[PDB]
Amino acid sequence: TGRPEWIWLALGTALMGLGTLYFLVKGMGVSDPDAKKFYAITTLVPAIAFTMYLSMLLGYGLTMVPFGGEQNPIYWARYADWLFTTPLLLLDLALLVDADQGTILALVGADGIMIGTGLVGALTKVYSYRFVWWAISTAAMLYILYVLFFGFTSKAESMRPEVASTFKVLRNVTVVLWSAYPVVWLIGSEGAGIVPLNIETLLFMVLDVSAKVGFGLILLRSRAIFGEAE
Ligand SMILES: CC(C)CCC[C@@H](C)CCC[C@@H](C)CCC[C@@H](C)CCOC[C@@H](CO)OCC[C@H](C)CCC[C@H](C)CCC[C@H](C)CCCC(C)C
Ligand SMILES: CC(C)=CCC/C(C)=C/CC/C(C)=C\CC/C=C(\C)CC/C=C(\C)CCC=C(C)C
Ligand SMILES: CCCCCCCC/C=C\CCCCCCCC(=O)OC[C@H](O)CO
Numbered sequence: 001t002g003r004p005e006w007i008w009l010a011l012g013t014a015l016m017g018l019g020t021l022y023f024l025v026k027g028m029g030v031s032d033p034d035a036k037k038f039y040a041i042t043t044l045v046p047a048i049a050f051t052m053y054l055s056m057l058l059g060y061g062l063t064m065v066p067f068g069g070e071q072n073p074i075y076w077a078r079y080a081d082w083l084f085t086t087p088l089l090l091l092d093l094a095l096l097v098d099a100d101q102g103t104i105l106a107l108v109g110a111d112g113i114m115i116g117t118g119l120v121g122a123l124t125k126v127y128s129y130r131f132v133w134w135a136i137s138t139a140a141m142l143y144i145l146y147v148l149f150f151g152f153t154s155k156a157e158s159m160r161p162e163v164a165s166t167f168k169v170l171r172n173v174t175v176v177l178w179s180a181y182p183v184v185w186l187i188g189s190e191g192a193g194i195v196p197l198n199i200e201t202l203l204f205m206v207l208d209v210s211a212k213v214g215f216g217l218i219l220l221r222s223r224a225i226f227g228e229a230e
């Protein structure tokens with residue numbers, strides 16, 4: 001507990017753990033193949049986040065990066081988390097709307113670029129170059145958001161109203177929450193260093209729990225995840 005941000009890492013660990021356990025129990029008994037997919041993806045997201053929050057709490061997921069002539073604490077474990085959880089979250093959305101495979105690959109590929117370039121930016125030793133990587137990552141994010149709003153144009157006249165409804169809600173949650181991440185990065189200690197690491201950790205920890213457990217609660221409560229069955 002020598003790091004001030006430990007409390008947010010602990011709490012994050014606890015909230016992701018407990019969310020995982022709730023989604024394990026809730027999904028118990030589900031036989032519908034379509035619903036099984038959504039429960040698998042959506043359980044599985046906070047399970048990964050739990051391990052990476054734990055890893056940060058215990059100090060494994062932290063490294064020191066020299067830039068600005070200082071040794072800067074960088075939690076690299078975030079990117080290991082997001083590398084897997086953010087395409088899984090996009091897959092939830094894509095499966096909802098029965099997205100084409102081409103569209104799914106575009107989303108997951110862009111996502112991979114977003115997280116990969118975020119990681120390179122996070123570990124870059126030349127200060128000004130960190131923001132070049134930030135810009136590229138943000139461009140990838142904007143591409144993803146574009147596809148979410150303008151890429152499911154063929155899947156509207158055949159979509160079940162509850163699918164459309166739950167998708168629209170989850171898409172809005174996604175755009176609002178995901179758009180905050182580049183802002184937090186930019187102002188936090190990985191970027192401009194105007195907001196201290198402890199507040200920077202609090203902000204991510206609220207975004208993460210909201211984007212994974214919050215998102216999951218909304219999705220797994222909806223009839224949208226079930227095939228139409230009599
Ligand atoms: C998709 C789903 C169906 C399934 C996915 C779920 C599952 C695979 C996810 C579990 C997540 C988690 C356990 C991942 C563990 C990361 C670990 C392997 C990284 C090892 O890094 C080595 C340490 C040295 O001690 O570097 C520490 C110090 C270094 C000098 C600092 C720099 C390290 C790098 C920045 C690490 C980059 C993180 C990569 C994204 C990890 C890639 C994942 C892969 C190798 C497992
Ligand atoms: C079965 C039924 C009708 C309801 C069960 C719902 C349950 C039990 C959910 C539990 C999951 C859990 C223990 C935690 C995650 C809940 C998280 C959210 C709703 C997202 C919001 C959380 C935050 C924004 C972070 C909290 C912030 C601080 C400062 C503690
Ligand atoms: C201490 C509290 C910690 C609690 C957290 C520990 C999490 C990490 C470890 C193991 C389980 C990983 C399994 C997660 C994947 C489950 C997928 C699933 O739920 O699948 C349902 C689908 O219906 C099936 O066909």
Ligand SMILES: CCCCCCCCCCCCCCCCCCCC
Pocket residue numbers: 172175176179180183184203206207
């Ligand atoms: C269909 C309607 C589309 C909804 C668009 C909403 C896009 C708004 C994006 C919000 C950007 C958030 C940036 C705020 C940063 C503050 C960081 C702390 C957050 C906890």
